[PDB]
Design a protein around this ligand. Structure first.
Ligand SMILES: NC(=O)c1ccc[n+]([C@@H]2O[C@H](COP(=O)([O-])OP(=O)(O)OC[C@H]3O[C@@H](n4cnc5c(N)ncnc54)[C@H](OP(=O)(O)O)[C@@H]3O)[C@@H](O)[C@H]2O)c1
Length: 342
């Protein structure tokens, strides 16, 4: 019963792999290069961990070799690989295609090589496949676990963000379509996880680099912004802590009540200024080294944008989510401590 995790070098995946190893699972991670496999193996230093090389999830039958090799021992699959970095003017080839093709590739590989062996697939979708991007600030829209981003292929590429959100939406659509079309052929049950913007520390301190992964780069850029930088105080989106996201993925293949569930991971609205306020509150001795405190935010005026109804998700998961102030605090502390400032 090993666990296969797609895209094991990224921000969220490294936490997922940490939780899996905490629970004594045997783990096979997918990474682009031997280069990245070598560094990861030294970071975890755990004999239960191995990596296979998948250079490009969009390519033909990308995951077939893994299942030809380990098909008999893999019992659970976490499909977390999807493009988050991409050329702003290659939205199809860098973003939508690998999102969709990586998902078809993973599911077809299971059907071809382990149809009666793989028991559960937990797929990292996104809050982006549930929400409507241009209605994040609309309090009359309520989102729940059965809501879908209505983006179409025609209007998907309005800008880089709608494109990414469409990439997650189209990929998830294909996953459920595959599941409904192959109920009797393949044995695995699918669970999708839908994080909103994921904040929290990098799994390893050494991965605190000059530029972080996209979601935490939001925090990192605000933390290093000149004191006079204009900070938006208007509602931006929902957040979730990476450690809750990692925990949720692992539960996702363990708990039978999470079968066929879309899990909506949000724990609070925020603006950029709400993040900046944590800097000033929690590290007052650094006041002036980053933009100032301002309590006049949408959030502090009762303004949180579209309504999040994830009561079903919270009941199913049963563990309590990490609050915003702590998530931001831990992100910031790890950066400042790495820099020798606190
Ligand atoms: N706010 C968030 O962070 C957030 C929210 C909702 C959902 N998600 C989803 O969580 C998952 C991980 O996101 P993240 O924040 O951890 O960003 P990340 O650090 O950039 O991780 C992305 C992972 O997927 C790999 N990947 C992307 N495209 C690939 C491709 N075409 N072929 C092979 N590997 C590919 C990446 O490897 P390389 O770096 O080597 O290319 C990396 O390991 C993604 O599916 C993302 O859509 C993230």
């Amino acid at each position: 019963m090993s666990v296969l995790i797609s895209g094991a070098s990224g921000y969220i995946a490294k936490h997922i792999v940490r939780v899996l190893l905490e629970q004594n699972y045997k783990v096979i991670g997918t990474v682009r290069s031997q280069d990245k496999a070598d560094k990861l193996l030294k970071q975890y230093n755990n004999p239960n961990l191995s990596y296979e090389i998948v250079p490009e999830i969009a390519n033909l039958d990308a995951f077939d070799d893994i299942f030809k090799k380990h098909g008999k021992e893999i019992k659970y699959v976490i499909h977390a690989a999807s493009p988050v970095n991409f050329g702003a003017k290659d939205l199809e080839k860098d973003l939508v295609i690998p999102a969709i093709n990586g998902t078809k590739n993973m599911f077809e590989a299971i059907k071809k090589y382990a149809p009666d062996t793989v028991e559960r697939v937990v797929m990292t979708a996104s809050y982006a496949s549930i929400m409507t991007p241009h209605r994040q600030n609309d309090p009359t829209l309520t989102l729940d676990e059965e809501t879908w981003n209505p983006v179409t292929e025609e209007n998907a590429y309005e800008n880089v963000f709608t494109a990414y959100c469409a990439s997650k939406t189209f990929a998830e659509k294909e996953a459920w379509k595959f599941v409904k079309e192959n109920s009797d052929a393949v044995k695995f049950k699918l669970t999708t996880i839908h994080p909103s913007f994921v904040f929290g520390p990098q799994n390893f301190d050494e991965d605190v680099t000059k530029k972080l992964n996209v979601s935490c780069e939001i925090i990192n850029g605000l933390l290093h912004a000149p004191f006079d930088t204009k900070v938006e105080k208007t509602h931006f989106s929902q957040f979730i802590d990476v450690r809750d996201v990692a925990k949720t993925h692992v539960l996702g293949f363990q708990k039978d009540e999470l079968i066929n569930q879309r899990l909506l991971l949000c724990n609070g609205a925020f603006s950029q200024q709400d993040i900046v306020n944590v800097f000033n509150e929690d590290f007052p001795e650094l006041k002036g080294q980053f933009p100032p405190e301002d309590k006049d935010t949408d959030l502090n005026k009762g303004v949180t944008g579209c309504k999040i109804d994830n009561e079903k998700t919270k009941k199913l998961l049963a563990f309590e989510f990490t609050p915003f102030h702590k998530t931001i605090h831990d992100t910031v502390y790890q950066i400042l401590h790495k820099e020798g400032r606190v």
